[PDB]
Symmetry: C3
Subunit: 327 residues, 3 copies
């Protein structure tokens, strides 16, 4: 909500309280999403100041407060800052910002701290829209990722670059995104995956108009995707994955947006196992929007993964019912 | 404070900074409230959106930031989300919400993560006011508590239900609240307390009008109340407790609200000890309200617990002086 | 930003998103500021309510959310409440507040949880301006510090008092600040430093007017300053330090504020080493203010510490580039 706006600066204090429960058989150890209370909330701010007609400053922070912990020792589990960055936008030259932000590969997609696919720290991002204002519909972004040596291999990263180009024409959109980066000493000391460099690229198509939203991506990865062998308690990254994502949605005027999606991600050459599906499921769900501030929804994960998945990846279904308020 | 209100949605960003110190002899190990700086702050939001004339959406989050930690490793100690839930209210049919919220037994009372007495995660709560609008003054609430297997027995819980009925007539109010729930494998592996089910019920009376506020509850519990044997460093729950709470207050027009309260809680059949007082004290205090945003107060705990309390419960007094700002 | 102001109470919700990176050679283990992403954000509130013409209530909370952690286990590292206190201000009698706040020695200075130099918990602070309104330009503050026995010597403290007097006349300002406090059992069990009392005093001069800002402090300490012997992995406090701080700045009308500063802090009688520089560096930097909400800057630390610093204090340079948004 725009809580402030005077003298050219406007702040937006936003957030939401989400009542959310997951239903999966057993102890949700072997299911898709786990089982139980998954209630949580979000708080964040988006500032933007008009330095002058062409120049704009801006920043944004976003936190995630879990709502299913005891007020005990485990009180903090799951909490974290998702975003934190300040930047400038100048006329038609483009924009630049640095901080914790989204990797450029995510730029095309209808994991966190996973190189260029989700949110990561230390990224300087440049973005240009309409090709310096010369080509309506042509945008691009390049990104520099500062090395991040964490106490954990899954959480670390070496220096890298990435970029993405996308062209949008009348509800239509096409996107290409690629990234490469070094792997830390620790990432390399890991038991699964082999290489001193990690890459992630994905392309995408989308039709976004007329209450309709279809989208289809295809991409791959090298030593970027995190995988764990539940049997051996072994971890590392997949040598190679091939990922497919499909999404079809339709928004009814009353507030019903039914969704159908399919996702498959399969590892290749996994040291010891060979080929293994990491993710495989359909997803049926419906969201109902009372208005812009309130909504409820039931997602249904029809897990396709079988019980003899070498990695030990779960094969059970999960049903997610949630009620959402937001400002 | 109502920071937002446009297009039928209004947000209330609230909170407070509390300068608070506790005075108790020794190292406050053996006193009632501990000794020292107990300064802390609170931040939270309450949203509410009018989906239409009869339908209302709403959500609320509340955090607790301790103000007495170093900016060091212990920086986070005590912090936690107290509340997090979204719900809907429809005409006279009642309301429903899910998330971290208050147990229904608390519904009658002028511990957290303790079944139905304080705040707990994963509760779906239904509440009806004025009996579908047919009986002014008659309300009720039923509550479903999702199992919560935590790493800690004191923090865990099995499935359960609870409900409460209350009737309020002209400053008068009567309340009945009951709850029962399963106990987790871990809760049962505990050394104190025996049963595979936990119950908590309490009833209450109150006179709330004319600058006066009297109130008196009485209740009991089975394997619900957490107790620790400071000697044996043993923990578990009390087999049976009988709890009494008394409160008398009077608000002077200038801003002085003097208070007198008495609280006694006594365990029964404690494996090994027999009967033992868990809590026993009078409480004299006075709050002074400068206005709705500022206030100060001195509470005085006249601990009745004696020095030969088998559990090792503290017997010292405590004086609490605090200054409060709030928006 | 003043988000609220009705019925005599006004809240200011403030904060900022800071993109910030540090450039230092090697693994920044031996440099001045460390190396890498140092992005972070801040959120805080300052309330103030007019109880009546002369009486004012107020409170303030301030948190620090790191923006360079993974959303993993290390998610919380660095986060903490910096401030948390409520107080009252009465006519010309002065003001009093209690909570986590700034030590009075900091009162003169153009470490946290370090007695009276930075922020500390449990301080009751009294402040008088213009000598009960009788002497324009004469202010003073006395401060009581509640004992703070933490699990860590560096983070603990015994009872103490401190005070400061300062006189400001037309861009000119002079300041004296002194403090003394007991040292905890643990602080005394430490291998470096000897005494059962800690003192910190510093004096200061400043010229603040005409786009100019010069300032110069001088002070000392006894068993107050924390020091670590990187070789022996020994820690404790310095027996004696002599600290000098110098700052010259000039604000150009366009938004350029170039700065020059020098800081030297040298320990004395360090058990085993003798005299050792703790801090020694010049600092060249320039801040550029687009407006009151946006800014960018490059600081350059010209570390003077040599490579043969007995404590093992770093000798490398560091360059800090940061972009700031704030409301
Ligand atoms: C505003 C500061 C931007 C700092 C960017 C640092 C990028 C470091 O490595 C990039 C490797 O690609
Ligand atoms: C909005 C989701 C509500 C989910 C409620 C789940 C209740 C589960 O167990 C209740 C046992 O009593
Ligand atoms: C509003 C409460 C103020 C409490 C101040 C306690 C000070 C305790 O010790 C001070 C030692 O100097």
């Amino acid at each position: 909500a725009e809580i402030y706006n005077k003298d050219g600066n406007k702040v937006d204090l936003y957030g939401k309280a989400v009542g959310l429960h997951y239903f999966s058989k057993g102890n949700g150890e072997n299911s898709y999403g786990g089982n139980g209370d998954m209630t949580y909330a979000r708080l964040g701010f988006k500032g933007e100041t008009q330095i002058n007609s062409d120049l704009t400053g801006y920043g944004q922070w976003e936190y995630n407060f879990q709502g299913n912990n005891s007020e005990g020792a485990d009180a903090q589990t799951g909490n974290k800052t998702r975003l934190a960055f300040a930047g400038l936008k100048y006329a038609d030259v483009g924009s630049f910002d640095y901080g914790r932000n989204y990797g450029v590969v995510y730029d095309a997609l209808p994991y966190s701290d996973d190189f260029f696919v989700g949110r990561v720290g230390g990224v300087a991002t440049y973005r240009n829209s309409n090709f310096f204002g010369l080509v309506d519909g042509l945008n691009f972004a390049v990104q520099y990722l500062g090395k991040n040596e964490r106490d954990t291999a899954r959480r670390s990263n070496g220096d890298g670059v990435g970029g993405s180009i996308s062209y949008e024409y009348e509800g239509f959109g096409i996107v290409g995104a690629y990234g490469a980066a070094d792997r830390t000493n620790l990432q390399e000391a890991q038991p699964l995956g082999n290489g001193k460099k990690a890459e992630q690229w994905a392309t995408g198509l989308k039709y976004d108009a007329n209450n309709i939203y279809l989208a289809a991506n295809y991409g791959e990865t090298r030593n970027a995707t995190p995988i764990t062998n539940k049997f051996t308690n072994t971890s590392g990254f997949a040598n190679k994955t091939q990922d497919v994502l499909l999404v079809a949605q339709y928004q009814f005027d009353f507030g019903l947006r039914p969704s159908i999606a399919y996702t498959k991600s399969k590892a290749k050459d996994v040291e010891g196992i060979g080929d293994v599906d990491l993710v495989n499921y359909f997803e049926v769900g419906a969201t109902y929007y009372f208005n812009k501030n309130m909504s409820t929804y039931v997602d249904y994960i029809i897990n396709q993964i079988d019980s003899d998945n070498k990695l030990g990846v779960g094969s059970d279904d999960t049903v997610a019912v949630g009620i959402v308020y937001q400002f």
